Amino acid sequence: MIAPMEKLVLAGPKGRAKELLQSLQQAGVVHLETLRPEALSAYQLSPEERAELRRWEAVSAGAEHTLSLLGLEAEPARPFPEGLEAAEKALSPIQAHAEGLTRQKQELEEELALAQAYLEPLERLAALAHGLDKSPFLRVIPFLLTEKELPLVEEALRKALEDRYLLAHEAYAGGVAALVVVHRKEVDQAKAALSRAGVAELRLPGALGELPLSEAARRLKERAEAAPRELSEVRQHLAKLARESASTLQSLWTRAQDEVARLKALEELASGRFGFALLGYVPVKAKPKVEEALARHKESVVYAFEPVDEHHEADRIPVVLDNPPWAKPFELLVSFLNTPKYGTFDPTPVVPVFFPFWFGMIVGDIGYALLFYLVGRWLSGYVKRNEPLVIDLFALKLKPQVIGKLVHILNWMVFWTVVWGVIYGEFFGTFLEHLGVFGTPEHPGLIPILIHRIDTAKTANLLILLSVAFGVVLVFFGLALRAYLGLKHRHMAHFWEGVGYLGGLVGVLALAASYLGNLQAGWLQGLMYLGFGVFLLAVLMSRIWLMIPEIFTQAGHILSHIRIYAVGAAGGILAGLLTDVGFALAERLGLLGVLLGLLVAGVLHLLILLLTTLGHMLQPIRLLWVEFFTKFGFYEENGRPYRPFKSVR
């Protein structure tokens, strides 16, 4: 059910308001509604309240920055109990050490990256320049080239006249070096002509360009030898800072998020000359916890609980779902879709009975059910450890609470997968060859197979009518709900649609039974004519025209239930084929070939299981998500989600 809502209406003196919200948050179950549409004035922050909000906001931001810098996650903790000034001076030292050390870490490794790419190339061009690092008229900046670009640069560089050599050079193996000049005023022009043919200066930034070529070697050498010690010292100090700071810093972050949220919530009040008021919604089941939190205030400050409307403004009422504990884990399978409008039906009680059953009927194999149970036990380890599960390949992250819901669903699903596996007699398909536990009349084992499934020519009609009956049940349940909601909310168009389609479908279904070739007519003609007369009368009453084409969509949604036979028959028949191939290998290659036949049967069974289990799991849930939920208009209007004013905990 959608849980019943009641309006908390409250008023009191403007001086108590900020404290009453603390009390009310500290047992938080109320959804605040902004009390603006009133003759009074909206509550607004003083410059002192604005300053408190600003300060706690800066604390929250600085704490999260410091946590994320130290590689910590800002998950909630017990709130830091001391004052705002205490929180500020607790945060300021640890953020200052953290920023200083990470900046030192970054700037150091950035200097190391620039150095490592140049140690030998720079030392080599400096040895080419070794006697001529400060030439009076040949102190040109360093130069380099590709091993094929070296002759091209040298063809122009021959113009630098000198007694030692021209600007033409190659001088190194890892990359050609041209860090020389013969007469620098012309040699800069020969370097620019080399640049026009394709060349670049070797004076790389950093230690390679901040000092002359006589000191660039020293700088690169001294940083390259030193960087690992001071890096390891900064890195172990950053590790120390995190294990000292973590607990207090996320305890501060929680306190700051809580305090900021109360200051933000405080503006949603109405206020007058001296008094204030608020409106909020409480689900009736929670009301005792509000009552004791308000009753603490010595005055018994003025409040009342008022019953909510559902005929008007139902689109403003907050929605939350109340489910029995056997149903509640399946809420996860509907909650992805829209929130339902207040006073509407919630289908979450329906999914726990049909979806696990249809999945069991679809797979129907003892061997696969055991494999599903084993993987469920493997996930059950994470919730036993109270440990979150991650698979970064999918960005998958989920908490032990979600793991608990999924393990519960899988355990309720494997029971139906075992029982249909007995009824079809399947274990990896055809392991009744290995021992005659199951038997047909042709091979009469210890127990009969109640429905052999694999004998399509004998069995298929039974399972098709079974699947069609299931579909008729769900679609007629859905159209009955459409009629009932339309009747109960006094929206007669939804009543005439619900009764209209349901009358039309018994007309069509009677016609199908008659034309299938049954053994009698009797009352079928009367039922057919009654069904089509009800459809026509409901069309006429509504003056609505979309029912004429849409009847075939409804017929499609009755008949589309064949998939619960089809995917299951295809899966069982393929598993039977692979198990028979397994015996054929172990027979043709004899006793030596049993290990080969078993290995290839096993790997192909696990291949097709891994490749198709997702599809087998998705088909039964479509039938709820579209063939059922569309009938009573689950997607037709969106509810306001309940989210209470609550501690960050």
Partner: protein, 73 residues
């Protein structure tokens, strides 16, 4: 007997295959627009899933005709 068993098996296969081909052709574009709408925001999940599964009725009418042919032996 004769070739009639042959021909009705060809007819039912043709029907279900062509109906499966049309539904696949429809579903390609509809679900491409659907995944785009969900990628911009998750509030469109009802609308995308409804529209994607609407043209799945065509392959179901093909299955119905195939079953009628199989029963008309």
């Amino acid at each position: 007997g004769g070739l009639d068993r042959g021909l009705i098996a060809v007819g039912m296969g043709l029907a279900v295959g062509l109906a499966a081909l049309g539904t696949g052709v429809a579903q390609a574009r509809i679900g491409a627009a659907g995944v785009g709408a969900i990628a911009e925001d998750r509030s469109n999940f009802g609308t995308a899933l409804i529209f994607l599964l609407l043209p799945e009725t065509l392959v179901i009418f093909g299955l119905l005709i195939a079953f009628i042919l199989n029963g008309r032996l």
